[PDB]
Ligand binder design. Structure first.
Ligand code: G95
Lengths: 323, 10
């Protein structure tokens, strides 16, 4: 069994209510990884055990260039640990906040790699349901890596629906803000919101009051900068169609509709999956312990441990080499 | 630059 003391704990990359993510070094190999450490006490209290099991199961059963890879899933008496390959390039949220806006060419690169990832998950009957800038990381080469599969739903084939009110408030599709069920097209709405942010430098709808936010998502008409290209306006308008039936990617062919849109005219999609598209930005990391593309808010904090049977989480533990 | 968002469920 793998344990806490098999790793050195170097720098805090993320922190929140569920737990934290730390850059670690595996003592045996000397190799670096990102370890998401979640408190079982919190997961049980919030009644989110099913989501933690789903995340591990999706990570175990997925392999794609633009999805994060699980090395070890292990647990202690009160903690759940995901050991994952370290994306040194940081979040897309970090980079877009720094640069304010991307060019249409750079957004097209990131958009294509996300579409490739979403086609993969959808062909595997998985709906991701949490596309956003914080969940999109960059690897050392500058390629996209989707992280955090906690809100995934499995077994969702052509036209199957979901009931859980979940996601992130700012990225919720209009149909999720209505009663009853919704389809896998919510992922293409999410793609639309991130694409909108990359090219327009803001969320298409924002208010800190969720009441006002959800009214904007349901009722408000999106706007575009005058100088945005016609194909970019058409793509965003297609992805952000409030009716999922009339949304780009909402038809039976799914990602095909999005891939065949005139905005991606210049893209060969077999080259996308083959990592043959040239990244417009290459992370300037000097070492492996270099965390320049993460917030000082987190990386400046001193690493510490928390002072607090069959408290086991079944169907969680895993090794990439054993399976 | 918007504030960090948080995921949620039910
Ligand atoms: N809900 C937000 C969530 N933040 C994350 O998921 C991550 C932060 C930093 C990550 C990372 C960095 C480098 N390489 C990476 N490879 C795989 C991940 C990753 S992932 C979170 C979860 C739990 C507690 C707090 C925050």
């Amino acid at each position: 069994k793998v344990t806490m003391n098999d790793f050195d704990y170097l720098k805090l990359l993320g922190k929140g209510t569920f737990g934290k993510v730390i850059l670690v070094r595996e003592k045996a190999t000397g190799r670096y990884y990102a370890m998401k450490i979640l408190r079982k006490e919190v997961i049980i209290a919030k009644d989110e055990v099913a989501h933690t099991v789903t995340e591990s199961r999706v990570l175990q059963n997925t392999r794609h260039p633009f999805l994060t890879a699980l090395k070890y899933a292990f647990q202690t008496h009160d903690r759940l640990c995901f050991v994952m390959e370290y994306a040194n390039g940081g979040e897309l949220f970090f980079h877009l906040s720094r640069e304010r806006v991307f060019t249409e060419e750079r957004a097209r690169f990131y958009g294509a790699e996300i579409v490739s990832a979403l086609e993969y998950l959808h062909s595997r009957d998985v709906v991701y349901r949490d596309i956003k800038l914080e969940n999109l990381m960059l690897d050392k080469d500058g390629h996209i890596k989707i992280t955090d599969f906690g809100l995934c739903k499995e077994g969702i084939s052509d036209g199957a629906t979901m009931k859980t009110f979940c996601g992130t408030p700012e990225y919720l599709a209009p149909e999720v803000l209505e009663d009853n069920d919704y389809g896998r097209a919510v992922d293409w709405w999410g793609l639309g919101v991130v694409m909108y942010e990359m090219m327009c430098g803001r969320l298409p709808f924002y208010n800190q009051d969720h009441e006002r936010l959800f009214e904007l998502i349901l009722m408000e008409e999106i706007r575009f900068p005058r100088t945005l290209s016609p194909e970019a306006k058409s793509l965003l308008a297609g992805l952000l169609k409030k009716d999922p039936k009339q949304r780009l990617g909402g038809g039976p062919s799914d990602a095909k509709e999005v891939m065949e849109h005139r905005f991606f005219l210049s893209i060969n999609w077999q080259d996308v999956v083959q990592k043959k598209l040239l990244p417009p930005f290459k992370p300037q990391v000097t070492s492996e312990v270099d965390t320049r593309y993460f917030d000082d808010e987190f990386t400046a904090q001193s690493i510490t441990i928390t002072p607090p049977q069959r408290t086991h989480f079944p169907q969680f533990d895993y090794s990439a080499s054993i399976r | 630059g918007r504030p960090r968002t948080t995921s949620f469920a039910e």
